[PDB]
Design a protein around this ligand. Structure first.
Ligand SMILES: [Ca+2]
Ligand SMILES: [Ca+2]
Ligand SMILES: [Ca+2]
Ligand SMILES: [Ca+2]
Ligand SMILES: [Mn+2]
Ligand SMILES: [Mn+2]
Ligand SMILES: [Mn+2]
Ligand SMILES: [Mn+2]
Lengths: 231, 230, 230, 231
């Protein structure tokens, strides 16, 4: 199976697989069952911002998710990613819907990684229809509204259920290197999760994977396009 | 054929393809025959730095190549690259040798492109043996001395003739987009030693169509960039 | 007198100091009479973006001013700023009003200078009421709407006439150094509304000696930059 | 008194004021008695590198000090700097000598702070004789060898004792802002501590202070130019 490190913006409590009984943000290290979560007020139809930060010195993977009204949720997890991630990775965004659905629209995404310097930095503040530096997987699509639709949206604009999709940056990322004194990464994305369902589901994740990571089969819904099972 | 924009550090004067009669830096737009050149003193065995600068505003592709002693050569060419390059490109380093040879060692390479924002920036100040975010073409190799040898160097450290190689950054780059108010790029690389009577053939920073490959027969004076000298 | 290099967004044509007979962007080198101008459609009440670009390599000071609808004006001037500016400078925004007026509201300002490295980069996408890393001169104020009002605006939001103000970045900037292979700077700011029959007088990004102050009598057409129109 | 947050590269054990009984790196929050230290092998005459990292999300001030042979020491301290530092600060480097001495030469210094964006980033890879964007205090001098000599060095090159000096970046830095979701800073400097003394002393610190911070009187030696006393 792939190796996954992720920050999940989990809109739907799957309390049967360890989700807290509210929407939450989580840090996922090789499991959809987050090593740490925080209660998250997802604001339907509002543009949220997620920032993810890690460095090899503090060894603390952190994320904050905020909306324009000031509300935010933060979660941090002490982890030495040198010991979890392959040296080379791809980085991406994933999202899913299941029985319940939502738009999992990404409006921007930036990422920086540095080994201290080697560095990779990309920023998408607009996505093209033919976003050649993105590898789209599953239902993920770009263009023509400048956004990245991680999961299926019909032409009328309504999200679809049982959808999973991801967008990986095209280039592999050298995420750690033994000679490096510091290896840091940061990611920011903005998103717009909207649903008229009974409940929104399932969420968006920023993830770091093996370079050849693919959507595991059956990873819609609770599995967020990141894992083959809920273990 | 590929579409190439390149800044060449041309160590070897090939005067019947229109090179000046001295080593030179050149701006190449879709031709190995540089639109503009400047005399360049390649300092054998010294680490050089090339800086290449463009923006969609001043529409001036500029390059400076310098050495630590301060000597430098600069060339600039007014060109609207929106009218030469595909929107999407790959960026790379190329080098070649021919009858005469030189090491074509890249010690570092950075690149930034911004559309104003979408942006891509990378920097390699050390290359790895398996540099997964580089597409190596031809004779180019990395590692583990931290360098990118664009052209073949044997075990004894002697550069080989009729070698060509390139290194492209893995990801396509969105180098211009018509609504961009500013589409700027910059590249810097550090790098050439030869015990030949003359070093050749040079190194280029280049920007190419995404699927660019070394043109057949582009060793020597063609710098791995062009299928011919037209 | 101060030494000024400026990019002016000149909303008001003062044709007997050599302005063109339309609103324009201009590159000013030690004179309010721009060395180069381009016709500029200031879009009343819309947020504009100015980008200013220079490097010691192409030696071309360029500016583009644009609006969200895509309209834009660009001006470029070939100049070796090593020969005009002191090595150390302050960088700023200036604006003025005269008989006619406009808000001269800065919504953001970034600046990068690099000597290739020594570097300074700042960005303000929000200004604070007490913006300690800005030196405000004349009528310029910040806060707490997140903006920098270079010129006086009364409570009712009406801009006042014969207002001049500037905002300099607190730290001196080492804008060139003779050994620098590349001394580049860039600045971007976003910003103008008037119910006057004509907006005036404009906004400038400028680079000045470190101790630069508003010249006496530099409201109106002098843009807070120059003691006279010579 | 000033408010000081600092990362100290403490070359001299003052075990009578809480120093561990070896050279160490430390995180100093309003006291010279470090809240956390790590044993540090200062390599006489070698060029070391210090990286300091903090962000308002993880709230962990971290530092690593490394030398070209690979040896490094790291120290991290969980602290919410919002609650310690004034909103506006100056950032600097300080060093001292006492009864024992060393060069406290800085060869480069970079700093970045961001509020998420407002940002300040400066880099000095060479210091000029007239480094106008540095406020030099005490014995600190620049030019003409491209370095910043935090403490006194005689013309023959030997460091002097009972020396204290600092270099602050000229502009105040907006280090936190209540509206910011993230406020991060990073600092890197390289240094060359060399001594032919019986023991080197006293060390170098990167520090963040109130904007009007000055060398406290009598802050040579153990106090590293940062504090008025050893409390
Ligand atoms: Ca869930
Ligand atoms: Ca040639
Ligand atoms: Ca005018
Ligand atoms: Ca001590
Ligand atoms: Mn979950
Ligand atoms: Mn040539
Ligand atoms: Mn004018
Ligand atoms: Mn100590």
């Amino acid at each position: 199976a792939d190796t996954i490190v992720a920050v999940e913006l989990d809109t739907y409590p799957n309390t049967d697989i360890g989700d807290p009984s509210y929407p939450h943000i989580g840090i996922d290290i090789k499991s959809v069952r987050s090593k740490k979560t925080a209660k998250w007020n997802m604001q339907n139809g509002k543009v949220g911002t997620a920032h993810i930060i890690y460095n090899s010195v503090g060894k603390r993977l952190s994320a904050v998710v905020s909306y324009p009204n000031g509300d935010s949720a933060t979660v941090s997890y002490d982890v030495d990613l040198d010991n979890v991630l392959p040296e080379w990775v791809r980085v991406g965004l994933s999202a899913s819907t299941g029985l319940y659905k939502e738009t999992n629209t990404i409006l921007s995404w930036s990422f920086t990684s540095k080994l201290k310097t080697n560095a990779l930095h990309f920023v998408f503040n607009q996505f093209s229809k033919d976003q050649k530096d993105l590898i789209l997987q599953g239902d993920a699509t770009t263009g023509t509204d400048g956004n990245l639709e991680l999961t299926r949206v019909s032409s009328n604009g309504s999200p679809q259920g049982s959808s999973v999709g991801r967008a990986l940056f095209y280039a592999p990322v050298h995420i750690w290197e033994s000679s490096a004194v510091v290896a840091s990464f940061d990611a920011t994305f903005t998103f717009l999760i909207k649903s008229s369902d009974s409940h929104p589901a399932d969420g968006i994740a920023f993830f770091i994977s093996n370079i050849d990571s693919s959507i595991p089969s059956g990873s819609t819904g609770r599995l967020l396009g990141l894992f083959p099972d809920a273990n």
